[PDB]
Design a protein around this nucleic acid. Structure first.
Lengths: 57, 141, 131, 185
RNA sequence: ACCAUGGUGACCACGGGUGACGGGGAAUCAGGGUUCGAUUCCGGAGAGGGAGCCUGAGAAACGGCUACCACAUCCAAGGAAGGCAGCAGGCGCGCAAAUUACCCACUCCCGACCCGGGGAGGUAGUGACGAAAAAUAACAAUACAGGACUCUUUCGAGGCCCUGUAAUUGGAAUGAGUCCACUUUAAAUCCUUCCGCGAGGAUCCAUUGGAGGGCAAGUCUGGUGCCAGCAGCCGCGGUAAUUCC
């Protein structure tokens, strides 16, 4: 069939629950802007590649 | 052409007021039949009781069943159909609960591929829908 | 005592009220806000009276400490200090007794007298024995 | 009814189009080169810099020697000379138009205590101002956006109750004088 | 009462509707405008719906009266007493709104009055309606990565600055919180002031929306296969989904 009215919540009920694991907390407020001003602007990147964005792989 | 002389402010101002009755978003806000027609009666939310789970079928390129309900309202009671805007959340609503239906996003017009639904359900049974989806709150015992 | 220094400013005497009123500022570097009975005993050796007619109040310490500022005054007599004086500052050191019933009691008392007329013997004993 | 005040206004303004990539990157390097907390307090001083330019440019469309051009214009110019942003010898209604956002942040308390050598590392200036150390002449202030005038610009120093100017050491040196002498000599 | 036949109107009369109290004003912002204004100020109106009055300088008064209509209370059943669109509170309607608190000390008002009264009004509690400030960490010694400053050189590595790893520490750093005393105030509580405690995952724990395009940010991995769902708009999903979980 083509999912008539039952199996609502089909894909969420059968996904595996990988646990949200933990790391040290992120900086908040003023300190958050410090740790990302330095990441973008004071660190000139010596390598090229058409200047890929921050969430690269 | 138009009127331009220092004496025609009666003709100009009377020609503007009757030609304002020809766009919709003035006329639906000033003629009063359109607020005696929407089931919210000129409001943003309305509580109502759930009569029937009903699944409408999606529009022309898509193919899925959009999970909806058949809310009848408690203020000036009228029949509406309302969307359940989340993944498993048809299961949290049961028969003859009370739900706070909201608008659906673009002012009395159906959004997306759902054919002719105008409303979405939030806060079934005085706990939130996002609280039920995220495991914050539950149904009563 | 050690470093608690008492300046004042905007001095004004008046014989409309028989008082000498002035604005006080107290500068203390690293102490708490000095008490009122510790400062009015110092204006008694500034204007040369005894600490019985000096009324100091309204102190407000600035942000950071140091100079607090309040208002204070000196009368010409203790019997003048009873006449032209609000009764609460006359009682901040004990010279007037305001310990009464509440106004919830007093209003219910007044409307109970209102429903009884003439009987002076019972316009006064209108519900005192229920205690 | 009430003796309430009822008067308040917004200090900043939100930017018109969001997410354009040239704006928020060049405005991010105002947040880090002067060490601030969020972008609401850049939109604060941009709205301050806005209303001064709006007022002054309105005073240029007036004809010359108009009385309120002279009065309001000179009252404007004396107000932003004494705050130290506009040097006094070049006082005109035109040199206020080249005055930029970089110059209003320079006269804050939070960066006139960094460059004077009271502290290092511009973020540490908030860690000394807000954390109750650094005063103006006889007034301690925990406000980083305190716009210091040029008059009281020589008088930035630590306070007398403070560690850096006085004593009665804090609870971590008192902890260190206790953790050896707490079970022994 | 006796006469005359007039008055108004397409320059919108007359009638209807109004989610119509009017205004000062508010939101907006190139100019022209558009929308809102129950709401603290001024004016009007009305105390359940109509009507009639008394007193008084002033009322068609309603925390005055008389009657009718509507709702509703006690009763020993003969009769009595009603009017919160005043302050709190309750029920109900609803998407939708506060404590049955303390006091006349302030601003003023009333009276025979320096003295009494005032749910006017002031103070607290509830308050993420909204508006203003403003924490959740900063310096270090290694340290691992970058820099026009080092050799007579792409020798060899740095004695020198910036950054993140990962640290190990530290100390005239401090707060939120806790708690004496002052101060505050009519009495207090806040706020400010100040002893004593109070930070190594400062675990004393920042979230809310997003990551195809508009529109800042991933074709990373796992799962489901036009199903479940997402998606303001275009669109994404039919067995490798940059968009679902």
């Amino acid at each position: 069939v083509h999912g008539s009215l039952a199996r609502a919540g089909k894909v969420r009920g059968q996904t595996p629950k990988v646990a949200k694991q933990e790391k040290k907390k992120k900086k908040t407020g003023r300190a958050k802007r410090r740790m990302q001003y330095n990441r973008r602007f004071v660190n000139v990147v010596p390598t090229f590649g058409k200047k890929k964005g921050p969430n690269a792989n | 052409g138009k009127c331009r002389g220092l004496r025609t402010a009666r003709k100009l101002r009377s020609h503007r007021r009757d030609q304002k009755w020809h766009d919709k978003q003035y006329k639906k806000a000033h003629l009063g039949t359109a607020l005696k027609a929407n089931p919210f009666g000129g409001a943003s939310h309305a509580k109502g009781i759930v009569l029937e789970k009903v699944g409408v079928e999606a529009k022309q390129p898509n193919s899925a069943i959009r999970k909806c309900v058949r809310v009848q309202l408690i203020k000036n009671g009228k029949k509406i159909t309302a969307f359940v805007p989340n993944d498993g959340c048809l299961n949290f609503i049961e028969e003859n609960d009370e739900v706070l239906v909201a608008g659906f996003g673009r002012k009395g017009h159906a959004v997306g591929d759902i054919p002719g639904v105008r409303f979405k359900v939030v806060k079934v049974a005085n706990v939130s829908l996002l609280a039920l989806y995220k495991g914050k709150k539950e149904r009563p015992r | 005592n050690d470093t608690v220094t008492i300046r004042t400013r905007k001095f004004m005497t008046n014989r409309l009220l028989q008082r000498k009123q002035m604005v006080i500022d107290v500068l203390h570097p690293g102490k708490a806000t000095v008490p009122k009975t510790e400062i009015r005993e110092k204006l008694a050796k500034m204007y040369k009276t005894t600490p019985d007619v000096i009324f100091v109040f309204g102190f407000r310490t600035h942000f950071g400490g140091g100079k607090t500022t309040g208002f204070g005054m000196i009368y010409d007599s203790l019997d003048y200090a009873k006449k032209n004086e609000p009764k609460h500052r006359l009682a901040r050191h004990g010279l007037y007794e305001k310990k009464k019933t509440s106004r919830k009691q007093r209003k219910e008392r007044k409307n109970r007298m209102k429903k009884v007329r003439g009987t002076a013997k019972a316009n006064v004993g209108a519900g005192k024995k229920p205690k | 009814p009430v003796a309430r005040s009822w008067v308040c206004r917004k200090t900043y303004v939100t930017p018109r189009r969001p997410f354009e990539k040239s704006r928020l990157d060049q405005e991010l390097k105002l947040i880090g080169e002067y060490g601030l907390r969020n972008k609401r307090e850049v939109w604060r001083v941009k709205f301050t810099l806005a209303k001064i330019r709006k007022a002054a440019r309105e005073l240029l469309t007036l004809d010359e020697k108009d009385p309120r051009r002279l009065f309001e214009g000179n009252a404007l110019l004396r107000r932003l000379v004494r705050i130290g942003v506009l040097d006094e010898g070049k006082m005109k209604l035109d040199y206020i138009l080249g005055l930029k956002i970089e110059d209003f942040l320079e006269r804050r308390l939070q960066t006139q205590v960094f460059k004077l050598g009271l502290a290092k590392s511009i973020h540490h200036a908030r860690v000394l101002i807000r954390q109750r150390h650094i005063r103006v002449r006889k007034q301690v202030v925990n406000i980083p956006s305190f716009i210091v005038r040029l008059d009281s610009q020589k008088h930035i120093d630590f306070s007398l109750r403070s560690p850096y100017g006085g004593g009665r050491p804090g609870r971590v040196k008192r902890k260190n004088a206790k953790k050896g002498q707490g079970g022994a000599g």
